[PDB]
Design a protein around this ligand. Structure first.
Ligand SMILES: CC(C)=CCC/C(C)=C/CC/C(C)=C(\F)COP(=O)(O)OP(=O)(O)O
Ligand SMILES: [Mg+2]
Ligand SMILES: [Mg+2]
Length: 493
């Protein structure tokens, strides 16, 4: 076969082999500077776990010298190891997202709590947030408490503020698998005498979470998202492997009561991104065997839909997002009775395409992610007449954006002038596979050649990460590189 089909075959063998007997693809998260700095400040303040704090310190120094992250995470590390204002500006430099205002408050309060700058001079209600992802309520309350105590106004804190932090005192792994949220809550809780009896036991577990490199990961892992994406890729191969069945079973038995899926085992918060991948996978690999879970996932998505036709990530009434809306459109299009909601979602996508053919950055920091999501919805949903033309013109502009920004090596990076990486290129490939058939030396041809070239001798891919959280801060789940390249090659072959 062609070099691309051979590449696809070697990668599929590797992804199949990585799926365990429990049907899950392990997907641990790498250490991150931000959480390792917060863990270091917490353990230092409590004079606890000397061995762990020594390793955290060495991890932070090594990482700053060899692989420094964005300016905000660097300023955080420097504050705990020891300009805050300019680092925050460069970190949120052109962060064009509906959460920018909240991120400015969050990030500045983090830095102030670590003694690098003053606390924001804002009304205490600024830390109020409507219910969204479960752990966000806890994070904002933690920051409010830290600011209240940090500025000398502890009496400001109300019992409803403390109550939101109680999950951080539970034994074992972090609530919702989110180490950042627990660390912020514990930094706040250590200021409360009536909560300190529970603090000692949890610092022991926090300290035990360190990874081999001495750091602390953002989250425990992303095995639900990764397993679902990998099953989708494998189910798109000409002859899908047998393992797709235990993978579908592993996902289905983890569904939440609302019918959706969280990003890892034990995450009770469902989200649209995870659910759409599981739904797409189950629809292809086990539509009868898991008919009930499929129906429950569709119901989950429809219950989240916003009145504007778009879909949020976590909760109805939070701002719709383009990538989530395109994903839900594609996932819901397999039933002809949801046509009205699918059409309204695709129209939302078209309405929000930018004048240069792009869409948005949100949970991915490359522009190609939202392009690939949008192009699949624009070209995957059936449509005719006026609506077909409108969607085809929008898809054409998106694919033209890809062609206009393709790097010389055939790949794409996080931004137009960034070096290529396999994940960003994988997303572009999925979109381009909906354009005209590949030709010698054309954009899709060259992107496939790039991916062929970047394959490791062990058949895998090592990529710069693209996932962000809290946005726009990158975190690294290495298992995703192989999975998304395979999804790209399955789409394109
Ligand atoms: C699965 C995908 C790709 C999309 C949905 C987001 C998920 C479930 C990602 C897993 C990691 C995680 C806890 C976050 F990114 C949420 O960040 P955080 O709550 O800090 O985000 P902000 O709302 O503050 O930006
Ligand atoms: Mg957050
Ligand atoms: Mg978080």
């Amino acid at each position: 076969a062609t070099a691309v089909v051979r590449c696809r075959t070697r990668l599929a063998r590797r992804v199949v082999a990585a799926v365990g007997p429990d049907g899950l693809l392990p997907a641990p998260c790498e250490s991150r500077v931000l959480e390792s700095a917060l863990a270091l400040a917490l353990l230092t303040e409590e004079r606890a776990e000397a061995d762990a704090t020594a390793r955290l310190t060495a991890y932070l120094r090594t990482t700053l010298r060899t692989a420094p992250p964005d300016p905000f995470q660097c300023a955080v590390a420097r504050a705990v190891l020891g300009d805050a204002g300019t680092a925050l500006d460069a970190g949120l430099d052109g962060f064009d997202h509906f959460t920018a205002g909240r991120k400015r408050l969050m990030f500045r309060t983090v830095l102030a709590a670590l003694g690098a700058t003053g606390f924001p001079a804002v009304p205490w209600e600024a830390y109020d947030t409507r219910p969204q992802q479960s752990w966000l309520h806890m994070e904002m309350k933690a920051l409010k408490v830290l600011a209240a105590h940090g500025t000398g106004h502890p009496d400001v804190v109300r019992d409803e503020d403390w109550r939101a932090l109680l999950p951080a005192l539970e034994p074992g792994p972090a609530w919702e698998c989110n180490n950042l949220a627990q660390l912020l809550a514990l930094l706040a809780l250590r200021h409360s005498p009536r909560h300190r009896p529970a603090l000692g036991d949890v610092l022991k577990h926090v300290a035990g979470r360190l990874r081999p490199d001495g750091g602390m990961p953002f989250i425990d892992g992303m095995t639900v998202f990764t397993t679902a994406a990998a099953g989708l890729a494998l189910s798109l191969l000409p002859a899908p492997p047998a393992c797709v069945t235990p993978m579908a079973d592993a996902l289905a038995l983890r569904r939440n009561p609302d019918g959706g899926y969280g990003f890892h085992s034990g995450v009770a918060q469902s989200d649209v991104a995870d659910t759409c991948y599981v739904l797409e996978f189950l629809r292809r690999a086990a539509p009868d065997r898991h008919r009930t879970a499929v129906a429950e996932a569709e119901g989950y998505l429809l219950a989240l839909r916003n009145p504007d036709g778009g879909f949020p990530t976590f909760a109805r009434g939070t701002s719709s997002e383009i990538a989530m809306t395109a994903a839900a459109a594609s996932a819901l299009a397999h039933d002809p009775d949801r046509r009205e909601e699918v059409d309204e979602a695709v129209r939302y996508v078209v309405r929000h395409q930018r004048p240069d053919g792009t869409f948005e950055r949100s949970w991915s920091r490359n522009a190609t992610n939202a392009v690939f999501r949008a192009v699949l919805a624009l070209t995957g949903v059936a449509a005719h007449g006026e609506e077909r033309r409108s969607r085809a013109r929008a898809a054409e502009r998106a694919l033209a954006h890809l062609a206009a920004t393709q790097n010389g090596d055939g790949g794409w990076g996080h931004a137009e002038a960034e070096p290529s990486d396999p994940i960003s290129t994988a997303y572009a490939v999925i979109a381009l596979a909906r354009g005209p058939r590949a030709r010698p030396g054309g954009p899709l041809d060259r992107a496939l050649a790039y991916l062929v070239e970047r394959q490791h001798p062990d058949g895998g891919y090592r990529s710069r990460p693209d996932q962000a959280g809290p946005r726009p801060l990158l975190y690294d789940v290495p298992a995703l590189a192989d999975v998304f390249v395979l999804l790209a090659l399955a789409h394109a072959t």
